[PDB]
Amino acid sequence: KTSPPIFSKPMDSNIRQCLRQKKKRLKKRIFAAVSEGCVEELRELLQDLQDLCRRRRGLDVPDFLMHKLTASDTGKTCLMKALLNINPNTKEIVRILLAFAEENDILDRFINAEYTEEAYEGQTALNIAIERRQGDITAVLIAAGADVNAHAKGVFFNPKYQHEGFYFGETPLALAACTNQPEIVQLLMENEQTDITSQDSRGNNILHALVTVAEDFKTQNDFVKRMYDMILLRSGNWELETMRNNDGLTPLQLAAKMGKAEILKYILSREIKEKPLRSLSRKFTDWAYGPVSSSLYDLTNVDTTTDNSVLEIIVYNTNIDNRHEMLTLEPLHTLLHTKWKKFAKYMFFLSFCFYFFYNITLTLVSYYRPREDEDLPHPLALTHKMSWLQLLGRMFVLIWATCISVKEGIAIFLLRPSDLQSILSDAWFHFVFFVQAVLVILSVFLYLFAYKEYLACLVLAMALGWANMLYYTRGFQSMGMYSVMIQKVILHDVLKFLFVYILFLLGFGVALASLIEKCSKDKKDCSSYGSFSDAVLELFKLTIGLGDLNIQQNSTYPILFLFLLITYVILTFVLLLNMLIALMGETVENVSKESERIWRLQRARTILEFEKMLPEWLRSRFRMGELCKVADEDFRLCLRINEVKWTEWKTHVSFLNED
Amino acid sequence: KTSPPIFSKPMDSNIRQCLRQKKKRLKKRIFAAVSEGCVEELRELLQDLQDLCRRRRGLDVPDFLMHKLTASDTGKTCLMKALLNINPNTKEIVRILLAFAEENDILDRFINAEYTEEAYEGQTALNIAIERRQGDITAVLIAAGADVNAHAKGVFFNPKYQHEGFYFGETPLALAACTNQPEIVQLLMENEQTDITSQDSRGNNILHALVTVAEDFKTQNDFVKRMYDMILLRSGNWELETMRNNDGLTPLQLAAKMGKAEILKYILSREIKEKPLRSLSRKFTDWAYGPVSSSLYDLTNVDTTTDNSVLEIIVYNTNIDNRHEMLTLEPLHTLLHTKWKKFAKYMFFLSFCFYFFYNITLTLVSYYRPREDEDLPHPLALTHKMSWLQLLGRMFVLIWATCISVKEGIAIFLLRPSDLQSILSDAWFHFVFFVQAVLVILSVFLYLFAYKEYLACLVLAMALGWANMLYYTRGFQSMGMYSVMIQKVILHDVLKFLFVYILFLLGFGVALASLIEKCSKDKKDCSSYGSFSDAVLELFKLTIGLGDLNIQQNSTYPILFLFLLITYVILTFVLLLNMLIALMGETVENVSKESERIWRLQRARTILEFEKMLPEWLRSRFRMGELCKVADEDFRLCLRINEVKWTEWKTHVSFLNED
Ligand SMILES: CCCCCCCC/C=C/CCCCCCCC(=O)O[C@@H](COC(=O)CCCCCCCCCCCCCCC)COP(=O)([O-])OCC[N+](C)(C)C
Ligand SMILES: CCCCCCCC/C=C/CCCCCCCC(=O)O[C@@H](COC(=O)CCCCCCCCCCCCCCC)COP(=O)([O-])OCC[N+](C)(C)C
Numbered sequence A, B: 001k002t003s004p005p006i007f008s009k010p011m012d013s014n015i016r017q018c019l020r021q022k023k024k025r026l027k028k029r030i031f032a033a034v035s036e037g038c039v040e041e042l043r044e045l046l047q048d049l050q051d052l053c054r055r056r057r058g059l060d061v062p063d064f065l066m067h068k069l070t071a072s073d074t075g076k077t078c079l080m081k082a083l084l085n086i087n088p089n090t091k092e093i094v095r096i097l098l099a100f101a102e103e104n105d106i107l108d109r110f111i112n113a114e115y116t117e118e119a120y121e122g123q124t125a126l127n128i129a130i131e132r133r134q135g136d137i138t139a140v141l142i143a144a145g146a147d148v149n150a151h152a153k154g155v156f157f158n159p160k161y162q163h164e165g166f167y168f169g170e171t172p173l174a175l176a177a178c179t180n181q182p183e184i185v186q187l188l189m190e191n192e193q194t195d196i197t198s199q200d201s202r203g204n205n206i207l208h209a210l211v212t213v214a215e216d217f218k219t220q221n222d223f224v225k226r227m228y229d230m231i232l233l234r235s236g237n238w239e240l241e242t243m244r245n246n247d248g249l250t251p252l253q254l255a256a257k258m259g260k261a262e263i264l265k266y267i268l269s270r271e272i273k274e275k276p277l278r279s280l281s282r283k284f285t286d287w288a289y290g291p292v293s294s295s296l297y298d299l300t301n302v303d304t305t306t307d308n309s310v311l312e313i314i315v316y317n318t319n320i321d322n323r324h325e326m327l328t329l330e331p332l333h334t335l336l337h338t339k340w341k342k343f344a345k346y347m348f349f350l351s352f353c354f355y356f357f358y359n360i361t362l363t364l365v366s367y368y369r370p371r372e373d374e375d376l377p378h379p380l381a382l383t384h385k386m387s388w389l390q391l392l393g394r395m396f397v398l399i400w401a402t403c404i405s406v407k408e409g410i411a412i413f414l415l416r417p418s419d420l421q422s423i424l425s426d427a428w429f430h431f432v433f434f435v436q437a438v439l440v441i442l443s444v445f446l447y448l449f450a451y452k453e454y455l456a457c458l459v460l461a462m463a464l465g466w467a468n469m470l471y472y473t474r475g476f477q478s479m480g481m482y483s484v485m486i487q488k489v490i491l492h493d494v495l496k497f498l499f500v501y502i503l504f505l506l507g508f509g510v511a512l513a514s515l516i517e518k519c520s521k522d523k524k525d526c527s528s529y530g531s532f533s534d535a536v537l538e539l540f541k542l543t544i545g546l547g548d549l550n551i552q553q554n555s556t557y558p559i560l561f562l563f564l565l566i567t568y569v570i571l572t573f574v575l576l577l578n579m580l581i582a583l584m585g586e587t588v589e590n591v592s593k594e595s596e597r598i599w600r601l602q603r604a605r606t607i608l609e610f611e612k613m614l615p616e617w618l619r620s621r622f623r624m625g626e627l628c629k630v631a632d633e634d635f636r637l638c639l640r641i642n643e644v645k646w647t648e649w650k651t652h653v654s655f656l657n658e659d
């Protein structure tokens, strides 16, 4: 993606880089013989190794012999070098190397060997055989004492990113499962020493590991769905799918964290009909008659009742790709729609009314202020009591403004740094609601010091206040697009047109202000291009189309003053301004193509954020789901959902081929 | 493409155009007999030719006999006329003509015959047989003494353009190779007299010739890739692919010169695994484990270390079609990205800073000049020393401006004439950087003559100077499009709208200025349409939308003055101006569809142009690549590149059909 990785030492190297002595020719000539496939040259070199071991001090002969078979810079052995280079005669050089280590008491050490390298640590001879797809060499090595629980930890086998390495699950069972080799997976699970409930350095197990390697888009061949079904259904218990890693996530919650929509649909809709495996399912269909059916969903680690539920991960954590496609799955779709009809319509309506009456009060009191030198109060709370009836509206300003500044200021403090790179993560409205409430109470405090700059701050509070009414247009679908593409346009288009337009507004502004002469004879001010600040204003009025091409200029070089104004009008009114209108037209077109996807993801935040304001006795009232016994000795919560599907049923009936 | 060619004399003609005598009927009747396929009439005419040769002076009888078989206007013989017209009985009239020339000592002359025509010179009887796909007549002619090294040079066999003729490689081996006939190619390479390392008049050989005939786009059947592999791998040496033609190019460098992207990808990625043919490859993969792999590339005639490298041909020589598609190939992609991280980010950042401070100095000194009659210096270098601290900024203008005018003026002098027909060949910024630096030093020299027209030249230097800051927006991808489509629009759209708009600005300008009368009673100037120059200005202010439809005109025919203004506003404000905005909208749309292709090709020029400023000890430091021994007795430079490809690997594993 970004950059290719660097590795400090290569795993295998048959390319010699640039810059009869038995202590050199024994060790080096075996590696080259076993790599090319010279069988006859190999037996003639092994019998020379035991010749040096007879002229050696006793009781240390296995330690001396392994040093002449293992490398020193890395822990790669003769059997590892043999299996990385597959030849047509590697079935027999395994037999010859296994026979040499059986003649000594070194067979247990020669197979269970590990790399000592910092970058390839823990890799054994089973990892090379399962990688190179040698199915019959694997059965021999298990039958000779290979550890089937060896973990391969390292910088290569556990990277930081999805590139820069190759993560598969760190066990030999997970390597066979992530390489689409179903027969070796059947082979290891039928062995007694295989620990299925095993965990790696990330805390993952085999079901966590298959989620990380799955495709985030639906395609034709999906072997990670058939491997998740195959390994789960053989264990026949609950310990795998209820286990948490170091981040505290199940296999179900890691699919919603990473964004895999096809693995998520499979787990929420499992239904197994055989009697010993009935209890593993999460959906229970009890009656169906034509198109209609009734079903029960599992709802255990899904609904908003514990921490890190799958309804809360999908909504709040943007940068996940498929968030609309997952919120329309079936246990999730009914839960959001039920929370809207039961308490969320009415809390969203009271927020619109307590804010619309806040702005009518703050406007009528600011507009109708006493405009005299002899009458100067601040228009708030009756700080000087003139005793007029219903003064509570002036009290209602300072009460409701200090509530918003406390509440929204906490929400700015709780912002993730990924919440500032999405429009849908509504971090714009947390800023602007805060600064409108600060300026209200700042203007009240500056009258108590009587500075008479309160009116500069009270005017800006009315203009932001009526501009924040654009938040509440997400209640309707039709008006919910205009608050979105007023923000796509002002970031993708206007802040890139701004840097180009200052270069032409600075350059011609200094140039036109340097060609004039001082016209103040007796305070005439004939020249409208006198200063730098006067010339930038008259050039802005000409891109808009409000100024004049006044040629009668009291200055030297009158024909050069015409050449530089007409060049400005062509570049910035005919060419640049009509260009930026054709860049707004491409942004507006793409928001309207996706108007439904954007409106539905803005409700789902407002539904789950009014739920965190409710008290606990009130949230316990609206809990949807009842206790239910779906099999023997197992109790769980459930939703009953009826579903009538006319288009799916009629295609099932027409295609049936009654002939 | 452009025009069909003309040929001075046809190659074969069976259509007689418009405007018993044995010296006429012997020669003419053989050609018509051998063309139609009259076998019995042919033997009755050959025995009449030897009757005339018995009544002839001796020792000259082969010279007399060939003149009655070869034509005179061209060198076409009886065997050539036989093979151009294929009949079902041309297997035997070859046998009859070969038997007649064997009875004399004229067999060596009768087969090895050449056209003497200016347009078809050198064409022999093997070229006609290999063209007409007669595979078994070819083996007979080789077995009778045909020259298999005859070159066919001529205006037809070596044209100027790709049309106007048919270039194939000028040898009989290249004709068989460029006509998709693999069996005749095997036939000639197994003959001993075949010179494989042979060159034609262009200097090309068989591997150069196959590059010129290849398709520049990837399609299904590509026989030129299978012929390049077939002929190279049989020679088994290095003389073919390291040979240069008259322009000094290898077969590798001619593919990048002509733009063939599929031949270029094949050569840079050859990998042959068998032991006698291991050494011919250019990529050496030494370890691979799942998706990741490590490889070594050849880098010999690719990297910027000699003249005409393939990294330098693709970048500088536009008019080549596939330049983005070739710069993303693998030895080329890593080299450009490595030169950016090691020295090119920092040289592109110092150029932005030494030019941005050049414009702040030249603006603040021009704007704050002494505006008095008693104070008139030139604002540069303290030509009159007033002794103010840090005068070095005024010195910094004339130093840095004379550097740019020398450096950019050399670059204008080194421009190819094809560099002035591409936006991406940045010949616009070589002009405008030059003229901004000339006007600075021109204004300094005109104060030394004290002409007081220096200020007309110093003002234009500020306006161009801030407009050249649009060059440095190619560092970012998002802003790198606005400098491009400000140039596509001002060439494809505005200079075509300009010729149409002058016709309506000239015609109505003279017409409206002829209907008025002189209003200067006592210097009133009531009529704003008095002159030609006054009327063109008031009509330009009305297309923009700044003028007035002032009907109160002090002139004769007042209702005709209304009819010609309203006709102008409809034609040029409602119709023409809104048309040109819909022609800018189609240009802006196509630049944004190709925004990534244009930004990436502008970096690649700036990377290779800061490299030509570095000194030789500094360029020798940043050389990337190490000496390496990839096979016996062969040393070469290499890059090691790691590559992890998740999408290619997982499709290889899912499609494997483990069943
Ligand atoms: C029908 C079936 C049952 C329905 C259940 C009903 C449950 C009722 C409540 C239950 C508990 C909730 C307490 C929340 C209070 C927080 C106050 C607040 O700041 O407003 C918050 C919400 O405001 C509300 O959601 C509640 C509105 C009623 C407030 C009750 C006190 C005043 C009622 C006295 C009546 C008048 C007295 C006389 C007045 C003249 C504003 O939050 P926001 O809109 O999200 O902010 C803008 C968005 N932004 C975050 C991006 C910036
Ligand atoms: C001088 C140097 C040369 C010039 C600079 C050159 C470099 C600049 C280039 C940079 C990256 C290139 C991408 C092009 C678009 C750039 C804009 C951007 O950064 O958006 C980024 C994220 O968008 C956001 O940041 C969302 C806004 C967060 C809330 C901020 C509130 C501001 C309050 C203040 C009140 C203001 C009121 C306005 C309302 C907020 C990236 O956008 P994107 O990659 O296209 O991804 C689309 C995702 N999207 C849905 C979020 C859009």
Ligand SMILES: CCCCCCCC/C=C/CCCCCCCC(=O)O[C@@H](COC(=O)CCCCCCCCCCCCCCC)COP(=O)([O-])OCC[N+](C)(C)C
Binding pocket: A345, A346, A348, A349, A350, A352, A469, A470, A472, A473, A475, A476
């Ligand atoms: C002069 C110019 C104007 C000013 C300019 C301002 C401009 C800016 C404003 C622009 C637009 C304004 C936005 C409107 C805001 C809310 C409306 C809304 O949400 O729409 C909804 C209607 O929902 C309702 O109408 C509320 C339900 C009844 C509430 C009854 C009172 C509460 C009583 C309880 C008191 C509690 C206890 C009391 C306290 C203790 C529509 O939703 P729906 O159609 O129903 O369903 C969704 C469709 N779906 C099913 C496909 C998903």
Ligand SMILES: CCCCCCCC/C=C/CCCCCCCC(=O)O[C@@H](COC(=O)CCCCCCCCCCCCCCC)COP(=O)([O-])OCC[N+](C)(C)C
Binding pocket: B342, B343, B346, B347, B348, B350, B351, B403, B404, B407, B408, B426, B429, B430, B433, B471, B610, B613, B614, B615
């Ligand atoms: C970090 C790792 C190592 C990095 C290696 C760093 C190597 C450094 C250098 C190494 C040798 C290069 C010499 C090039 C000099 C040419 C001068 C020139 O005209 O500028 C040229 C480039 O300018 C540069 O690229 C270099 C900028 C530094 C100049 C050094 C002298 C002044 C430093 C004293 C410091 C301040 C003293 C105090 C001042 C107050 C302009 O070229 P351009 O931008 O292409 O032109 C515009 C484009 N156009 C062609 C279309 C028109």
Ligand SMILES: CCCCCCCC/C=C/CCCCCCCC(=O)O[C@@H](COC(=O)CCCCCCCCCCCCCCC)COP(=O)([O-])OCC[N+](C)(C)C
Binding pocket: B419, B420, B421, B422, B423, B424, B427, B428, B431, B487, B490, B491, B492, B499
């Ligand atoms: C009176 C008679 C009747 C009217 C005339 C009728 C006949 C006229 C018709 C002619 C051909 C028909 C094609 C239509 C487009 C015409 C324009 C053209 O010639 O472009 C040609 C090449 O484009 C260039 O020349 C690139 C600019 C080179 C640098 C020049 C710097 C000038 C500095 C001065 C400063 C000025 C500042 C502005 C910035 C430079 C051809 O363009 P194209 O075929 O479309 O190929 C696209 C390739 N492209 C990527 C290069 C675009």
Ligand SMILES: CCCCCCCC/C=C/CCCCCCCC(=O)O[C@@H](COC(=O)CCCCCCCCCCCCCCC)COP(=O)([O-])OCC[N+](C)(C)C
Binding pocket: A499, B345, B346, B348, B349, B350, B352, B469, B470, B472, B473, B475, B476
């Ligand atoms: C007030 C209004 C403003 C005025 C209006 C002006 C408006 C006009 C201007 C518009 C935009 C301005 C353009 C910015 C120009 C350079 C920035 C740039 O290149 O971007 C790059 C940042 O590269 C860097 O930031 C430089 C790296 C650090 C330099 C450290 C100082 C040098 C020290 C050494 C001293 C040497 C020795 C000293 C002397 C002897 C971004 O590139 P990237 O993201 O890093 O990678 C590319 C992404 N890729 C990997 C996909 C390919």
Ligand SMILES: CCCCCCCC/C=C\CCCCCCCC(=O)O[C@@H](COC(=O)CCCCCCCCCCCCCCC)COP(=O)([O-])OCC[N+](C)(C)C
Binding pocket: A502, A505, A506, A536, B360
């Ligand atoms: C389209 C235009 C784009 C924006 C440009 C707008 C300009 C702002 C530019 C930049 C903005 C930031 C600086 C603030 C300047 C404004 C303050 C001011 O006006 O007061 C004064 C300063 O006026 C000046 O003379 C200074 C402005 C020109 C030089 C700017 C600094 C150059 C270096 C920056 C970059 C390199 C450093 C980076 C190094 C890494 C004006 O005083 P006065 O009017 O004479 O009043 C007379 C009365 N009196 C005598 C009693 C005092």
Ligand SMILES: CCCCCCCC/C=C\CCCCCCCC(=O)O[C@@H](COC(=O)CCCCCCCCCCCCCCC)COP(=O)([O-])OCC[N+](C)(C)C
Binding pocket: A498, A499, A502, A503, A506, A510, A531, A532, A533, A534, A536, B360, B363, B364, B367
């Ligand atoms: C892209 C990000 C831009 C940020 C803003 C984005 C939006 C921009 C929108 C608006 C902001 C733009 C400014 C307009 C209003 C001027 C305010 C002012 O204080 O001027 C004053 C000072 O200013 C000067 O003295 C002018 C100095 C001349 C050269 C300025 C650029 C040189 C430094 C470049 C620095 C880097 C800039 C490079 C920019 C490419 C006016 O002074 P005066 O009239 O000369 O004196 C007359 C005396 N009198 C007052 C008593 C009568």
Ligand SMILES: CCCCCCCC/C=C\CCCCCCCC(=O)O[C@@H](COC(=O)CCCCCCCCCCCCCCC)COP(=O)([O-])OCC[N+](C)(C)C
Binding pocket: A557, A558, A559, A560, A563, A567, B435, B456, B457, B460, B463, B464, B467
């Ligand atoms: C960014 C826009 C460019 C900025 C503009 C700078 C461009 C410069 C480039 C090149 C200029 C090269 C010529 C040298 C200057 C000579 C000075 C001179 O003659 O002044 C004379 C006038 O003359 C003029 O009117 C100005 C002539 C400009 C040439 C046309 C350039 C077209 C640029 C457009 C396309 C660019 C597209 C670029 C796209 C990015 C003096 O005036 P006068 O007649 O003596 O008046 C006295 C009258 N009296 C009789 C009453 C006393």
Ligand SMILES: CCCCCCCC/C=C\CCCCCCCC(=O)O[C@@H](COC(=O)CCCCCCCCCCCCCCC)COP(=O)([O-])OCC[N+](C)(C)C
Binding pocket: B502, B505, B506, B536
């Ligand atoms: C939208 C309009 C489009 C452009 C049209 C613009 C017009 C320019 C047309 C063409 C431009 C090139 C010629 C330069 C003319 C300008 C010089 C000038 O004005 O000075 C004078 C010449 O004024 C005239 O009278 C001559 C202009 C009209 C006829 C043009 C030539 C026709 C032949 C060309 C083609 C056929 C040949 C081709 C053969 C193959 C003006 O003098 P004055 O104002 O009377 O001053 C009075 C004071 N005095 C008496 C002391 C002197």
Ligand SMILES: CCCCCCCC/C=C\CCCCCCCC(=O)O[C@@H](COC(=O)CCCCCCCCCCCCCCC)COP(=O)([O-])OCC[N+](C)(C)C
Binding pocket: B498, B499, B502, B503, B506, B510, B531, B532, B533, B534, B536
């Ligand atoms: C497409 C390429 C075009 C090139 C430019 C592209 C951009 C064009 C933009 C601007 C240039 C256009 C000119 C506008 C400014 C006029 C300058 C001038 O010198 O006028 C003067 C002379 O001119 C005359 O005398 C006018 C002659 C009348 C007929 C003109 C066309 C006949 C020849 C057609 C030749 C072929 C043209 C065919 C064109 C289709 C004004 O003279 P006056 O006012 O009459 O005298 C009053 C006396 N007084 C001054 C003392 C008061």
Ligand SMILES: CCCCCCCC/C=C\CCCCCCCC(=O)O[C@@H](COC(=O)CCCCCCCCCCCCCCC)COP(=O)([O-])OCC[N+](C)(C)C
Binding pocket: B557, B558, B559, B560, B563, B567
């Ligand atoms: C390029 C545009 C065309 C140019 C225009 C030429 C077109 C000509 C074609 C044809 C004209 C044929 C008629 C002959 C002329 C007679 C003269 C006459 O009658 O004048 C009279 C007025 O009369 C008028 O107002 C003008 C009549 C024009 C006819 C409408 C044509 C529509 C063109 C549009 C569509 C074209 C689309 C083309 C698309 C490219 C005299 O005026 P008066 O009333 O005596 O005023 C004195 C008043 N007072 C004394 C009472 C105070």
